[PDB]
Design a protein around this ligand. Sequence first.
Ligand SMILES: CONS(=O)(=O)c1ccccc1
Ligand SMILES: [Zn+2]
Length: 258
Amino acid sequence: HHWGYGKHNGPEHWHKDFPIAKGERQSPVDIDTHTAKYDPSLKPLSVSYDQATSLRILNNGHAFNVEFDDSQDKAVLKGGPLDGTYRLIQFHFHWGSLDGQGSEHTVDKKKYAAELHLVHWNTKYGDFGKAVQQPDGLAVLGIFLKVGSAKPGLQKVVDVLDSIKTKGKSADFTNFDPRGLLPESLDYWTYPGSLTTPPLLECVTWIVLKEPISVSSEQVLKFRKLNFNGEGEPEELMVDNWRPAQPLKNRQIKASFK
Ligand SMILES: CONS(=O)(=O)c1ccccc1
Ligand SMILES: [Zn+2]
């Protein structure tokens, strides 16, 4: 009875195997824009993906991961609310079955069609494994996706999805530049949270961009053709792989802008 997004193994069931699901700093959360406060102590955010080197794309049965070679000091996120340097390890998305839903974080209760998560680990911890055992081990840059004009830089990802339709399939995915997935503005909201999928570890400093990127209906429709199941198994479309907003509890969301 492996965790998932269905009626019998979805978000409402996760707490049984992962008690931290009802923790003190769980994600995602609704971002109440009027309650968020501009933070003057936030330093300029720095996204340096010029030397990013992708290796492979994988369908893990929950989403698809574009993995990067993080053995060297490349693709770094720093500044903003972060102390030190965080290295990019992979990115993935969460999306819906319809354009009206799909994002994990919400803005004033508004749900976007999807949400991109660029995952980075704190280099002071050596690697990802050790980093997820620390309260400041990860930094995730979240970017909302709305349906409208196509995002040229996303097409290469879209076109390779037909080769990793089912759970367990992977394909070489080199030379992909994640800079093509970033919106113009780096204005953001930040708060301490967790991974949004089991084990739901609370090691994430969230940096959610205010400006969404636009992707075409055709592009997101191809996301929805992926499968949760493995090859040779009954088809269950990979849609609505998002966790709903969780209690903000003892937290404050800070804004990088006025
Ligand atoms: C950031 O939340 N996205 S997640 O699906 O929980 C995830 C976190 C870290 C590595 C892979 C997936
Ligand atoms: Zn995610």
